[PDB]
Amino acid sequence: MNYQPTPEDRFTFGLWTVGWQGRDPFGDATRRALDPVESVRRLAELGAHGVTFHDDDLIPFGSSDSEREEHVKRFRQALDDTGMKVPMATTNLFTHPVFKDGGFTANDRDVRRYALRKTIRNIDLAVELGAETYVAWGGREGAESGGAKDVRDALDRMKEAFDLLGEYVTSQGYDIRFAIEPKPNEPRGDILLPTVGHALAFIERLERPELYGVNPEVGHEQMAGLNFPHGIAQALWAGKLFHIDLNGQNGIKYDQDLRFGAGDLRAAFWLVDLLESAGYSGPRHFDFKPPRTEDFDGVWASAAGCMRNYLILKERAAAFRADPEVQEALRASRLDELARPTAADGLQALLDDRSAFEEFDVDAAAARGMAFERLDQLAMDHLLGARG
Amino acid sequence: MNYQPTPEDRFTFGLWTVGWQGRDPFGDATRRALDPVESVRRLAELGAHGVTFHDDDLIPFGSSDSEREEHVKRFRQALDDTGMKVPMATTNLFTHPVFKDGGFTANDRDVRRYALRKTIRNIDLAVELGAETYVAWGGREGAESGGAKDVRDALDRMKEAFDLLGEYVTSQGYDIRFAIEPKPNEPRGDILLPTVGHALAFIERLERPELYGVNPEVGHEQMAGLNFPHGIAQALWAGKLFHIDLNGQNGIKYDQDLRFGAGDLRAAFWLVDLLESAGYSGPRHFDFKPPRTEDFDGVWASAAGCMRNYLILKERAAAFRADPEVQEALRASRLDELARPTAADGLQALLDDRSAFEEFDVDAAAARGMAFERLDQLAMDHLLGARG
Amino acid sequence: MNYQPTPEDRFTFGLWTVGWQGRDPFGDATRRALDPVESVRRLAELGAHGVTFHDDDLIPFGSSDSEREEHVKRFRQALDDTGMKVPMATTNLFTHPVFKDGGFTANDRDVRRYALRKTIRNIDLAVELGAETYVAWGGREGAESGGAKDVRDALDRMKEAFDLLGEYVTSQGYDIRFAIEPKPNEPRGDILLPTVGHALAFIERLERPELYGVNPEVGHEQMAGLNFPHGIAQALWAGKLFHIDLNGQNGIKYDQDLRFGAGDLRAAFWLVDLLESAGYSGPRHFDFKPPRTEDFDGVWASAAGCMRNYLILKERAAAFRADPEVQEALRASRLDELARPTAADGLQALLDDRSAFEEFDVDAAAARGMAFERLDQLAMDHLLGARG
Amino acid sequence: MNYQPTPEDRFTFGLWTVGWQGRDPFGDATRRALDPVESVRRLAELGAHGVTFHDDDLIPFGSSDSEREEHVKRFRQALDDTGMKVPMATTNLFTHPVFKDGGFTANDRDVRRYALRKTIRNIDLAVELGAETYVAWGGREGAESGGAKDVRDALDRMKEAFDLLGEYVTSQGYDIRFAIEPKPNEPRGDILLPTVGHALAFIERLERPELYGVNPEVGHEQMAGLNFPHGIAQALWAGKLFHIDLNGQNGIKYDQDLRFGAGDLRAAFWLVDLLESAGYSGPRHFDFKPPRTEDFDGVWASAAGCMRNYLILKERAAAFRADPEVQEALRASRLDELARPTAADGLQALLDDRSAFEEFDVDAAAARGMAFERLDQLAMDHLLGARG
Ligand SMILES: OC[C@@H](O)[C@H](O)[C@@H](O)CO
Ligand SMILES: OC[C@@H](O)[C@H](O)[C@@H](O)CO
Ligand SMILES: OC[C@@H](O)[C@H](O)[C@@H](O)CO
Ligand SMILES: OC[C@@H](O)[C@H](O)[C@@H](O)CO
Ligand SMILES: [Mg+2]
Ligand SMILES: [Mg+2]
Ligand SMILES: [Mg+2]
Ligand SMILES: [Mg+2]
């Protein structure tokens, strides 16, 4: 009937999301800045579980150690007052002009050293605040032109950076894991580690791969026209889905950061189905921007709608999977056979099995329908709640 | 002045490329079939090093063991007559209706067993013909709808298939490596292992990863709007570029398979620069389709142009890298600094280095220009041969 | 509760849709051909209003005048037996190799003359069968390369063709209008008149513009990443929406021709809302392809689902527009003000109105929220039937 | 050999291009603001013909009539000192928060009235400064969500606005024409009049269509994956190319505004070929952004490169068209036949011509090759200056 979030639903929001002032490449801010304390409060009242932050969202850049301390304690007090948690944190290595060519892979060596020190400083803070995941979105790592960046050297520098962060964390005894967030472009012409697959592959080259996973974002993979639930299944299959950023995107264009549920709705349905089915237990984090058309009432409406749409899709996906008619259609489409080993009998028995080749009736096989269209219309009926 | 290929340039072509009859989703064949023997001949005269094949290009489907033998010997004779080599081969697991839901990840278990046997049969043949690389393009592995395919189960099946192929090859003592060819879509709505990064990550989960690399294709990565030279640098960095398919593509749309050099020309320039710089020593294979507007004279013209454009770009990229003014611009943009370790002095010295944070002049750093636009115009002048 | 189509709903299907055999650029047919008579029958039983055809779907190419006549009479008999209508027809100017460079804008003048005669022949037939709309999809009008086609000369040839067709129709006294179907690419690299807007503009240059409108297709505009309901509003605004092709498409890639409702579901919702609101009274034609994974049972399931999804969306859009809370949100977002003239008082009164500039409070204006996010979540709740 | 621009080449630049400070959606300004007077100067020294402006680039928003006057006279003095012209001007209706939902089609009626008054004020100024073209880019006219904007009502409002501007200009006796600049998205989710074709069609509905043309932009049409030279040929064919914005774009993604020549290089070649061939005589205006990686030396380098690349492409396109071998290839591909009327003999003679149908040899026609691949490689050789 209705769909109210509880903190048990693990919904979390970045300070920068509801706090986005509405500045875009062609326009000035349309909303005033939000005090972090005020956001914690408002989010708590909406049913959220926690918030996340960039170092610079919380502690304004160039802050004295003194001012730093005051900012953290007011924040901490808001968290104690509301019961809100801080499950993830990250570093802003993209806004300040010093990062115009990147942080960890900037051509200037002194900038790469500064980016590491800025990062290390905020990992200590995140650990204090209790975060369990440290996200890294290398927004400025990339190029607008081919000669500007040797990508093998840049990958060496990127691995060097993450390996040093891993050494730091292990030597401190910290219980925190890293999650690399890929994005194919924007604000660089091309960004390094453009998709979930590139980040997964990169991780396997690190000195301690087990400390690193991915933080995929709905809109990022869709900016490359990729199927996000598929990319998430691959990350789940690799054991690397450490966090996830949820939002909406209408296709291949600039990253819109629409509220979750907006953009590609069927994709959202299949994503919720997979997360709930796979038992994903991390935060459901919304990395989104209330449109600049909105005032603050529209900001909290947008934030509420993220949660609402997740909870509606979860109910429709559970209804779909629990429907006996759907379970029969799944067997009719042979999903059960997909889950069985192709050749548990082993290579030699396969080579020896004439039914697998010499005597296989390929024409009868080809004639069998997969029945996928009836299955997909049942999924559609369930999503629309039209199961007459 | 001019640009004639020699077999030393390692240019190779699939039988299916120049042999494409011009059938597309809206139209009938516009050219008659080509005899493989005739293609070997014509390609040899154009300066090509070798050819490649799908099992079904060479031996028509459903061929008796008898007919099989005759097809192979005529082919072999053409190769002896011309000096042409066969460096790579692959399996057609996409054309026959039995593969409509996939080969290795078809939901029907008996189809997956047949796909493995069909593959194993052609690996023996490729080894006989001397191929060093066996390519696998899983064109039908994927879905048009979310419920049709559990992607974790499909990845299990895909790993199972490649692991069995690796066991086969090792138990036979064969000297051949596999190269997985990613593609994001077409002819399935979404294909599994959609990009070079997804294939790289997948490989690391196989039982013997060292037997497997990638075969990226220019147009495939551009169908996801990705930067192909970047994806190739990542594959080179991982030690996994085992083969490469060259062609041209105009952006995000159906896969056009234009001749190499057509489509995104600057991308082609940066790709040739990287392959020649990195010392890539594999075949330069053209996987392309002469447009259906063409007769056979236009087919060989198209094939010649692939080679011609590679050789022109190689000369311009070598001229660019050898130009002292470009080498100065590279230092001005700090490419040399990119190649130096960020922190060879180690974590503790970095943490102890006040010049990396406490005393770093971020405002002076931010003010330094990267000089990338002057570097890129030198690259452009060289490509256009306008170095006045 | 449930959603059965009646012939009053004006649902129509091309013979080529349910009759698609499953041939794609990488694969053989997976279904046997369908007899047109059988399709008419099956569609009638599903609740369809009528069917459409290319000349070549009905009368196989190169048919004697004799065979032609027999094909038409069996068809006609099926229509009499079922009550099915034929509201639209079109010409196949894309499949035969003679059309490889186009029909009306082929470089060869004799091919352009043949394309006109082939077209004229089928207009007489369509008129006999009672069609009210003749569609023209110039699938082969275009180029893969810049020098192959002078586009100003091609536009001259295209206008020449349509002007001659208009002269023909007027001199025969026929009551039929033409509808130009744009598509941005596929099967040519770029097709002429790539979007609804280009076709609208072209029409205004014809000798009798009033005889011509557009036949936009859902998937075609989405292949250019465009908003289809917006393009349809522009066509409605121009008085030119003469027919519409419905299907589903997942973003910018090859044209998938998914059943209607699949692909971008929210877009489908906003399209149905606009058609029903604007009083569009033409056929709701499905130009789609049952996936090649399917057997014939899946074909009719796919066809039924097209109708079902339209009828479900129509109910949700009517519920949305009839909801008093939505009507209040529309006024809160000032949709009512959008419909009022900006300056009914005229230019001089506007120039004289100090409240429009000298004394306009721009800061108070900027501060007003548009309230669009709350409106969009009401639309979402209605679509999902979650109006608790 | 080398390629120096002269003011006779009609190269022009917006104040906002070289003056872009480097603010993007994720980052702060990296360059200090430029004084307009300084830009005029620097551009003059580079060989530019003139500059253009938004009202707000020249006169800071909220300026007293007094300050206004001083800004204009310093500007005017710079123009007198350098000989620079001001051929085009436009209005900023996108930056100030008051325009967050649009200018001419904002839902708030008072905002639409203010947008017209702001525009009228700057047309008087542009006319004083001698501009011949007034550009209108409706950057904020559009929506992020379907219910936010009734597009038929918005088109009514947009027509109302342009009709009032036309009445104003005619009643003042001003010699100035308007040029509508389409863009498919960014910064709105979808923008109204998304492509050259939609703007062309819209214009035909205005009260005095002859006062309005288009200002297409390279990167804008490529953001929809469209062929820009094709769109320009259609605009030329309609007599509506009144101005053009040149830059570079790498495919379908955020609008990059790269210098001209960057992005799709072959497209740039075919565009220059068409403009020079068609005798386009308007300004060659660069609407581009020097990358934020650059300091001011890189800004002027980027600006110089725009001009340089145009002049190099113009030389290669003229060489291509003047090459007797290319003129023979054009006849071999039947470009000459494309330019001949299909049926100058008229409808009745066509219907009576048995050679056009009854006796047309379709099989011999189909067999003729179009020879486009050889033609395209000649175009490629010329572009690369490899005409051995
Ligand atoms: O595209 C922007 C990215 O989504 C960031 O918001 C990261 O999630 C956090 O730095
Ligand atoms: O898109 C098609 C693929 O490129 C294939 O040609 C593989 O390279 C070989 O099966
Ligand atoms: O993309 C193919 C087109 O949609 C055609 O089906 C036309 O509608 C009819 O020729
Ligand atoms: O995408 C931004 C547009 O190109 C503008 O620069 C217009 O040309 C001028 O307002
Ligand atoms: Mg984002
Ligand atoms: Mg994110
Ligand atoms: Mg391909
Ligand atoms: Mg290939």
Ligand SMILES: [Mg+2]
């Ligand atoms: Mg289609």
Ligand SMILES: [Mg+2]
């Ligand atoms: Mg259609």
Ligand SMILES: [Mg+2]
């Ligand atoms: Mg732009």
Ligand SMILES: [Mg+2]
């Ligand atoms: Mg512009």
